[PDB]
Amino acid sequence: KRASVLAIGTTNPEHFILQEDYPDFYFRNTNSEHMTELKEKFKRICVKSHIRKRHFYLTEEILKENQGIATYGAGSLDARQRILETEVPKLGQEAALKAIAEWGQPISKITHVVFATTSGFMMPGADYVITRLLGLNRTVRRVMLYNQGCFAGGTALRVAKDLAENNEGARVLVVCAENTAMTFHAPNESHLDVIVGQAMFSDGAAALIIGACPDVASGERAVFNILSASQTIVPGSDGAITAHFYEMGMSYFLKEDVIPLFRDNIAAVMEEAFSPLGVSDWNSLFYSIHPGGRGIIDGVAGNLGIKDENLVATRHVLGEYGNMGSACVMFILDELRKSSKVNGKPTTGDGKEFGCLIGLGPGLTVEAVVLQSVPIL
Amino acid sequence: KRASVLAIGTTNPEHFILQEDYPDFYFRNTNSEHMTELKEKFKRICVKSHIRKRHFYLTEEILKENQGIATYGAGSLDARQRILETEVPKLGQEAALKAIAEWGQPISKITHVVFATTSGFMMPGADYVITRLLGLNRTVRRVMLYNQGCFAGGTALRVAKDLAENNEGARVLVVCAENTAMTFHAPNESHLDVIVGQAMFSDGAAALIIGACPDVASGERAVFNILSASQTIVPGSDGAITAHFYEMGMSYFLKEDVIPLFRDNIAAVMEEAFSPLGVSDWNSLFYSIHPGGRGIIDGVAGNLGIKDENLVATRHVLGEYGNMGSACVMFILDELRKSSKVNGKPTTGDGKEFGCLIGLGPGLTVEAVVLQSVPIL
């Protein structure tokens, strides 16, 4: 009678770049090699990032064919959309097929779709495209979530939750996907917000299948259960994150006190979701914190007092992929369940009963989804 | 147990223009009086449109600064967004306050918000802004439906339906709002899809309160009961409507066979929806069809054999407000119940029991929402 995660799939584009070689690549293919001062500010953040590699659609050749994207301030939304209109629902398809395989059921049994992305937008949306790409039924009930940032991962789950629970027999396909072709910019002295993003942002795609009352006889296997899903605006945070969709693509602004505002308010958000269960100790849980850089983790960590033991899964994704936007949190969920089977843990939650999903985005906004593990045999 | 409409509220900008005087206004304030031949076609279209007046935020002086918006092809997305980022949620606020006045409950009772808009987008979205303007709780669960076109009105009804029915005591605030500053273009000889759109689009905004199990003792009153809600892709209609968000704004393209596709495929949707109610006679129902111009309405009615008696509310909205996009279907619902009280009809559905809200848009896509009337006292 409660919603459950029945399958999980992930994927990234084949092309990847090592962080050790990114500063040279980023300044060479923007003809900004002469900005010696910025090359140092950027390099220091790369070292502090503790990110090893990132996947990208954008290659050295594709940027040569799109100088508008390679020039800061220049109009390029025309060229950016030509790429995103196709590659985003396509990368999603790759992920959906992996999760539909584990599910091991007929395509016709899918009745809903929830697509979440900030990378590109048009009409019809990616939710129509992937419906035709996967060959789903023409009567699937779709819900498109455009431009909700990095918390959209928690949003998608909250929407799918009420869908599966209010429609008997319902099976929901959820897809998160991103592509740095939307937010890529060349270095600029006045707008140093870019510097932080270009040493962080990557792309990827995750896919989930939600459904109530798992049919064990049919071959369905629950992975996580969803007990609750809340959303909260953070007090005194107006303006901390703002992103505009201009002719130059997405132009974003970061205030110097994003982490302190999240840090000094996360305690209250946890207290609300977990009192119905009588939980107080924050180390009795498994976590899937949105990897919004080391600061956000190492800072949400200290406040709640989370030991390094429980941040292994979240820090692992950050290191091997970077910030993939809304797909980061589903990536970390797949990380746990799989790591748990290898290490012989009693449950899919690293041997723990309850866990939490933390998504962070503009507002400030915080999405909190309470999860429950299942036994491993 | 079953979601119900509890209140309705609408509004428009004060500034309006008569269809009588729009062709002069259009070719004058875009510096295009030298296109005399093109002006006559427009004139003809404006006369066959059955639209009497439309309300716009865009006045003659506002176009006078942002000449980019008044010049076809020119990059003007920035200027459009500076307008839409503020004016759209401000227009929604004015509508919501009317619905809460009728609802007659404390603002602390609202638990969810659903906003749908194609006109403009940023981060955080217009769901955050309307949450601050109305002074709602920081812990409200909100959904942002961007760029779902003219069927978004029915989608907003379907999401809110599953939220209110899956959450005890939950009360959902629906808001739809559109602004022509996104779709405004100067006349061009080549792109004749633009010319037909300028005689159609308007500004407006509507609001509803959705909740399951009305509390009579708390002063709540029902208006319509939501029995079901569906979505469907039309077979073999790929590319019938496409819209791109380029640097010039929302560039849309309409192929020549849009009406014949909706016309011949709508019957299957109605049969699937009303079959479990034992209904087949389409004139025994009240309607709220999306007025995408005369063409759509006449084509849909001609197939199902709907008489002019049951299309008065639809045409009245198109005649007095023009095509406002996603808000049209909400306007018609309000005219239905308001007209019903004045004429002495026994129900909010023109005396009838069951009715249907039809949302049409790109895909092609068809949103059907079976509705039930309540007794008038």
User: Among B79, B74, B17, B76, which residue's Cα sits nearest to residue B188?
Assistant: B74
Whether A152 and A71 share a structural domain: yes
Asked if A173 and A1 count as a contact pair (C-beta separation under 8 A), the reply is no
Three-state DSSP at B317 gives helix
Say if B271 is an interface residue toward chain A (CB within 8 Å). Answer: no
Pair of tokens at residue B128: 């955050």
Number of structural domains, chain B?
A: 2
Among B191, B222, B253, give the residue marking a domain's end: B222
Give CA–CA dist A128/A117, Å, rounded: 14
Pair of tokens at residue B83: 């307008």
Whether B66 and B154 share a structural domain: yes
Pair of tokens at residue B48: 């066959």
Pair of tokens at residue B233: 């892709």
Whether B357 and B232 share a structural domain: yes
Instruction: Identify the CATH number of the domain in which residue A283 sits.
Output: 3.40.47.10
Whether B156 and B205 share a structural domain: yes
Give CA–CA dist A328/A288, Å, rounded: 9
Contact B122 A242 (CB under 8 A): yes
Say if A246 is an interface residue toward chain B (CB within 8 Å). Answer: yes
* A vs B: CB pairs below 8 A: 146
A359, β-bridge pairs: A367
Neighbouring C-beta atoms of residue A182, cutoff 10 Å: 25
Give CA–CA dist A46/B26, Å, rounded: 53
Three-state DSSP at A365 gives strand
Check whether the bond before B364 is cis (ω within 30° of 0).
yes
A113, β-bridge pairs: A142, A173
Whether A72 and A213 share a structural domain: yes
Asked if B290 and B21 count as a contact pair (C-beta separation under 8 A), the reply is no
Q: What is the CA radius of gyration of chain A?
A: 20
Contact B78 A138 (CB under 8 A): no
Give CA–CA dist A201/A62, Å, rounded: 18
Three-state DSSP at B121 gives coil
∠ Cα A239 A260 A313 (to 5°): 110
Asked if A17 and A56 count as a contact pair (C-beta separation under 8 A), the reply is yes
Contact B78 A231 (CB under 8 A): no
Of B167, B230, B362, the CB nearest to A124: B362
* End-to-end Cα, chain B, rounded Å: 24
Give CA–CA dist B250/B245, Å, rounded: 5
Asked if B175 and B204 count as a contact pair (C-beta separation under 8 A), the reply is no
Give CA–CA dist B260/A325, Å, rounded: 41
Pair of tokens at residue A345: 């843990």
Conformational region of residue A149, where left means phi above 0, alpha means psi within -120 to 50, and beta covers everything else:
left
Whether A214 and A228 share a structural domain: no
Looking at residue A280, its amino acid is S
Whether B110 and B194 share a structural domain: yes
Whether A233 and A356 share a structural domain: yes
Asked if A372 and B137 count as a contact pair (C-beta separation under 8 A), the reply is no
Torsion sign across C-alpha atoms A205, B117, B171, B352: negative
Among B178, B197, B222, give the residue marking a domain's end: B222
Residue keyed to tokens 């093109």 = B38
Neighbouring C-beta atoms of residue A47, cutoff 10 Å: 11
Whether B218 and B228 share a structural domain: no
Whether A201 and A246 share a structural domain: no
Distances (CA, A) of A10 to A95, A328, A332: 5, 10, 10
For helices B328-343 and B152-166, what crossing angle results, to 10°?
80
Among B174, B200, B222, give the residue marking a domain's end: B222
Say if A104 is an interface residue toward chain B (CB within 8 Å). Answer: no
Provide φ and ψ at A220, rounded to 5°: -80, 140
User: Among A88, A78, A93, A122, which residue's Cα sits nearest to residue B362?
Assistant: A122
Say if B140 is an interface residue toward chain A (CB within 8 Å). Answer: yes
Q: Which uninterrupted H or E stretch holds A355? A: strand A354-361
Asked if B356 and B285 count as a contact pair (C-beta separation under 8 A), the reply is yes
> DSSP letters along B251-278, please?
EEEE-TTHHHHHHHHHHHHHHHHHGGGT
**Contact residues, B window 306-325, toward A, CB-based 8 Å cutoff:** none
A174, β-bridge pairs: A114, A208
Question: By CA distance, what is A81's nearest residue in B?
Answer: B246
Three-state DSSP at A239 gives coil
Contact B159 A159 (CB under 8 A): yes
Give CA–CA dist B278/B7, Å, rounded: 29
Whether A282 and A201 share a structural domain: no
For residue B123, the 8-state DSSP code is: B
Q: Which domain holds residue B95?
A: 1-222
The Cβ-side half-sphere exposure at A371, using a 13 Å CA radius, reads 32
Torsion sign across C-alpha atoms A207, A139, A101, A93: negative
Largest CA-CA distance found in chain A, in angstroms, rounded = 65
Give CA–CA dist A304/A90, Å, rounded: 39
Say if A49 is an interface residue toward chain B (CB within 8 Å). Answer: no
User: Among B335, B337, B338, B372, which residue's Cα sits nearest to residue B353?
Assistant: B372
For residue A323, the 8-state DSSP code is: B
Determination approach: X-ray
Three-state DSSP at B226 gives strand
Sheet with A122-123: list strands edge to edge.
A122-123, B241-246, B249-254
Pair of tokens at residue A180: 């740095």
Whether B231 and B288 share a structural domain: yes
Check whether the bond before B58 is cis (ω within 30° of 0).
no
Distances (CA, A) of B251 to B66, B89, B99, B182: 18, 23, 34, 9
Give CA–CA dist B369/B357, Å, rounded: 5
User: Has A150 been annotated as catalytic?
Assistant: yes
Question: By CA distance, what is B120's nearest residue in A?
Answer: A245
Three-state DSSP at B223 gives coil
Looking at residue A65, its amino acid is E
Asked if A170 and A238 count as a contact pair (C-beta separation under 8 A), the reply is no
Give CA–CA dist B46/B42, Å, rounded: 6
- Length of chain A equals 377
Neighbouring C-beta atoms of residue A138, cutoff 10 Å: 13
Interface test mutation site (partner A, options B123, B151, B158, B193, max chain A beta carbons within 10 A): B123
Three-state DSSP at A231 gives strand
Asked if A241 and A252 count as a contact pair (C-beta separation under 8 A), the reply is yes
| Residue B240 distance to chain A (closest CA, Å) | 10
Asked if B324 and B340 count as a contact pair (C-beta separation under 8 A), the reply is no
Percent helix, strand, coil in chain A, to 5, is: 40, 25, 35
Largest CA-CA distance found in chain B, in angstroms, rounded = 65
Torsion sign across C-alpha atoms A125, A127, A131, A137: negative
Question: By CA distance, what is A246's nearest residue in B?
Answer: B78
Asked if B330 and B116 count as a contact pair (C-beta separation under 8 A), the reply is no
